Every structure is written in structure tokens, then in C-alpha cells.
Amino acid sequence: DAWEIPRESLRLEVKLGQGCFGEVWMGTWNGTTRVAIKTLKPGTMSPEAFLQEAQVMKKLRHEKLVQLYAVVSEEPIYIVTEYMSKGSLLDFLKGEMGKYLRLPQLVDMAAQIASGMAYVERMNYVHRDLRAANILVGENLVCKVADFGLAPIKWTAPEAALYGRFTIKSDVWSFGILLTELTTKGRVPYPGMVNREVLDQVERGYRMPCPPECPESLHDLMCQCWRKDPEERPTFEYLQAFLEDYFTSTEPQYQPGENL
């Protein structure tokens, strides 16, 4: 398989995160190419199960999906992808950058995520775990969809959470929650609510209100993503176009405020 590379060609420089699976590192590849590297800890998790997420990355290719570069598919396993210099979108929003992000930057970030998910939509795949922690940020506010290991009740559509009906339309619901993460600079949704209280409230028709300084027009889009019936929720194609055109077609009189 042409994705395979020799173990000697990777240098693991700075550790970026730990977990149940293994580790993630910034590194070099072939001595020239900055990369990110994920390792599986051999005795920790199924090796057959781990390579299925890498198989999904061999097929999907798009400027807004984190790109697979190479693999070492024998234990100890290594997975090599493009390096996203600013880490997870969740960390980015909460960190020192968050305070300067305004609505124009955040909507443009939303638009890119929608573009990647529009490609996932065209290919008839389902992500299942769309949220800020699974988006990565590069230079110039480039945002890419990551982590297809599944392909979090607060991000999951009711029909998916309750009955296992995962579809691209349940991803749209999550995207709607992701818009709140973007507009609150990365606060956990449904603040002050535990999981069980979220499920009962949501089924009884509760939806998060307009975030502070978020234009009503963007909150309406959130509400479209949270329609009880999955079929009446918008497509990613639609979401992409709306967000791309936002500051001309929907909010041409937008004024900067304190936070958004």
C-alpha cells in the first residue's frame, strides 16, 4: 500500500496531547515536511479498529478536511496528517485569540467547516461527532474537519441520541450547536444543564436562546439546524452559501460590538 512509510522517516518533536488511544505529536517527515503524528499505544486499544478511521481518511480528500499524509500500519502504529498550527478550534476559541475574534471571523470559520461537511454530504458519509473539539485551526484562520474515528449528548441530535438514527441531518444539528460554540467563544452549550436535563428539555421543545450580541439572523439559522424533524433541517450546501454570503445578503448593516 503506497501510504506506508518507513519508521526512520518520522521525527517526533513536540508532544501535543495524550488520550485513551495514544498520543499526538508535531514532527518532521523525510526531514523536510512539518507534520502531525498520532500513535496508538499497542496494549491500549484494538489495532484492527484503529486502522478503519485511517481507511476513511484514504478515501476522503478536500481542502477543509484534515489530510492524511502517511501511515505505519504495524504496531506500534503511527498516523501522519497535515500539521494544523493552532490546535483544536475549542482551545483556539477559549484561549488568548478568542478575545479578538469577532463575528466576521467566526462566520467565516463556520463557512469553512460547512464547506468540508458539504463535501462529506456529497460523498454520502456521516461524521457523527461534529463539534469545536473536532475541528482544527491553521494559519490565516483556516479551519478543517478532523477525527472520523466515529464516522456527547449536548451536540447530538435527539433522533441520534435516543434511537441511533445518525445521518447527515444529525450532523447539521451538531453544526447548529457548533455555531453556539463559535458565538460564545467556546462555552459548553446548555450552560448549567446536565445531560439528562438537556434531553428532556430538548424533546419538550427547548432550544438555546440567542447568544449575547449574536444577530437574530444567525440564531434563526441555529434554530433551522435544530428542527424536530431531520428532513426540514437545511443542507450543508445551503449552510455553506448562507454563511459565505452573510455580510452582504443577510446582515449588511452589521456593526462591531464589544465581543462579537
Ligand SMILES: CCOc1ccc2cc(-c3nn(C(C)C)c4ncnc(N)c34)ccc2c1
Ligand atoms: C485515524 C487517526 O487519524 C488522525 C491522525 C492525526 C490526527 C491529528 C490531530 C491533531 N490533533 N491536534 C491537537 C489538537 C492535539 C493537532 N494539532 C495539529 N495538527 C493536527 N493534525 C492535530 C487530530 C486528529 C488526528 C487523526
